[PDB]
Amino acid sequence: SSKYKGVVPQPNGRWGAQIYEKHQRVWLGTFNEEEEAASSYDIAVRRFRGRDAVTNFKSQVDGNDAESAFLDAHSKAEIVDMLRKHTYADEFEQSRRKF
Structure with a gap:
């Protein structure tokens, strides 16, 4: 249904994201x-x-x-974890903090 690559329906009207690498x-x-x-x-x-x-x-x-x-x-696995935990955005912003 979504026009976006990687996006799949999930329950309660929510949305999942997925990627395939070599099937x-x-x-x-x-x-x-x-x-x-x-x-x-x-x-x-x-x-x-x-x-x-x-x-x-x-x-x-x-x-x-x-x-x-x-x-x-980061490793691939670290990026995947940040995405699933919904911490990617906050960790990225912290990486932009100026010292």
Whole structure:
């Protein structure tokens, strides 16, 4: 139903995100809003596929390479965990704090 890559319906009107790598599903979490799920796919596909990634949306927080650096600072598994825990955004923002 969703037009967004990676986005699947979940119960209670919620939305899941998933990515496949070589026919292996990786679950990316459950989200209240459709575009939130789509944005979670985008984070995963950027980290998983790099320059080969095709995203739902253009990135809005990578003008200074900060988000690319953040993705490149982590393993795939760490990114997946941040997405599922809904901590990715807060951890990314902390990484932008100036000292």
